[PDB]
Amino acid sequence: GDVERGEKLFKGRAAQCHTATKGGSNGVGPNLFGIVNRPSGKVEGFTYSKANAESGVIWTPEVLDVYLENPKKFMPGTKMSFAGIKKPQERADVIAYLETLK
Amino acid sequence: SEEPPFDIRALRADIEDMISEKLELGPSLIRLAWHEAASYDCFKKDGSPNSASMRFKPECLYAGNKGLDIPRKALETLKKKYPQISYADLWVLAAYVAIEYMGGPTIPFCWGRVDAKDGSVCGPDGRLPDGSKTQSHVREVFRRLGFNDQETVALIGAHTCGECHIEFSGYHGPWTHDKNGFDNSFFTQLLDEDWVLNPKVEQMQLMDRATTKLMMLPSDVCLLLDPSYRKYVELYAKDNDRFNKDFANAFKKLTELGTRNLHKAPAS
Ligand code: HEC
Numbered sequence: 001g002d003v004e005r006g007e008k009l010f011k012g013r014a015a016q017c018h019t020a021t022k023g024g025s026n027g028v029g030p031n032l033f034g035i036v037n038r039p040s041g042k043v044e045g046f047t048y049s050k051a052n053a054e055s056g057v058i059w060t061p062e063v064l065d066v067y068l069e070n071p072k073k074f075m076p077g078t079k080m081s082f083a084g085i086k087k088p089q090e091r092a093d094v095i096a097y098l099e100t101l102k
Numbered sequence: 103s104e105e106p107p108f109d110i111r112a113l114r115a116d117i118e119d120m121i122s123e124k125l126e127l128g129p130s131l132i133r134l135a136w137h138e139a140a141s142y143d144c145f146k147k148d149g150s151p152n153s154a155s156m157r158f159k160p161e162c163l164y165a166g167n168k169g170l171d172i173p174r175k176a177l178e179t180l181k182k183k184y185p186q187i188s189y190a191d192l193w194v195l196a197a198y199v200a201i202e203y204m205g206g207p208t209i210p211f212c213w214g215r216v217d218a219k220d221g222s223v224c225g226p227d228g229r230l231p232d233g234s235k236t237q238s239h240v241r242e243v244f245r246r247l248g249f250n251d252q253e254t255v256a257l258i259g260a261h262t263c264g265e266c267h268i269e270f271s272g273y274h275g276p277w278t279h280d281k282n283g284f285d286n287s288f289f290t291q292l293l294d295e296d297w298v299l300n301p302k303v304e305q306m307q308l309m310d311r312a313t314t315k316l317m318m319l320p321s322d323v324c325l326l327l328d329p330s331y332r333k334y335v336e337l338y339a340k341d342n343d344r345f346n347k348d349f350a351n352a353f354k355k356l357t358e359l360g361t362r363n364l365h366k367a368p369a370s
Pocket residue numbers: 009010013014015016017018028029030032035039040041042043047048049050051052053059068077078079080081082085094279280
């Protein structure tokens with residue numbers, strides 16, 4: 001994806017719930033710095049749902065693509081209240097921006 | 103299906119492109135199409151809904167339509183690129199594209215709305231709903247439009263996206279934490295949060311006590327207070343697929359009020 005479009009999409013779709021800076025604060029959602037290729041439910045200080053805590057998924061770019069299209073379908077019981085990114089180009093752009101967060 | 107006199111495929115892509123450059127335009131386009139239809143009165147048979155009559159005075163200056171010049175000027179550029187589409191059809195299609203673009207349902211688009219020639223066909227003021235009022239006023243307005251309670255609650259669910267502006271309504275902020283996303287989160291927010299008085303806004307509005315970043319109008323919280331509306335709030339908070347289908351049907355009925363012999367447009 002395009003990192004520039006990915007950052008702007010993240011500002012417009014993720015900023016009310018997630019921070020992207022190194023050591024950024026936990027809010028509605030956890031800090032997502034370094035999340036690409038991490039196991040799910042392990043950001044320090046965040047209290048996850050029962051579904052996300054006990055989940056076995058690893059946030060690789062291909063898994064993030066399915067999740068971001070429909071979070072509640074991919075992980076039933078999740079507390080992430082996100083409508084999803086229906087177009088592949090926008091998902092790819094958002095995923096490319098998450099890959100730059102070390 | 104029937105092919106319109108405008109290139110609908112290229113038009114649908116140009117609306118998505120315009121929305122990608124400024125995501126806050128999505129909800130604004132939905133509000134524009136809703137207020138162009140909300141002038142209707144099914145008992146008096148007037149108001150000129152779905153005719154783009156809001157382009158003229160006096161309807162453009164009504165208090166309820168403050169701020170709607172932004173989505174109107176954004177779409178004037180597309181009217182120049184596609185002159186065969188009427189302004190009335192363009193506003194409805196732009197709302198349907200924004201709903202689908204933000205993750206909502208795909209509403210089948212019917213074309214053929216005729217534009218208003220001037221402001222002499224406009225309805226009076228006082229037709230648009232007031233955010234400071236509750237269920238008696240909300241039911242009166244939606245009964246005047248020809249909607250039942252199920253459809254009323256599904257339609258107010260569009261507050262899942264967008265925000266209030268002090269300069270347009272005197273209220274402030276978004277209803278959900280995904281203001282540029284379209285799903286049933288208005289209803290889960292309405293039930294799951296503790297809505298407390300916001301002492302920082304002069305016009306009375308509630309805020310979520312968890313973060314204080316969200317808001318609800320008196321007209322939003324009246325859906326919990328009324329026994330009939332509360333049951334539909336509960337239904338949609340529990341089933342997003344049902345919300346998407348019921349919103350699609352009601353929004354299509356809204357944008358086809360006062361229309362005649364429209365044509366089914368092709369998909370995608
Ligand atoms: C609030 C309405 C959110 C928005 C908008 C976005 N996300 Fe989110 N996200 C949110 C929560 C509450 C949680 C925790 C969910 C749980 O069930 O416990 C998450 C989680 C994620 C994760 C997983 C993190 C992990 O396992 O440590 C990812 C990868 C994620 N969110 C991504 C993401 C993106 C890319 C978003 C915009 C495109 C986005 N989220 C928006 C809440 C919210």
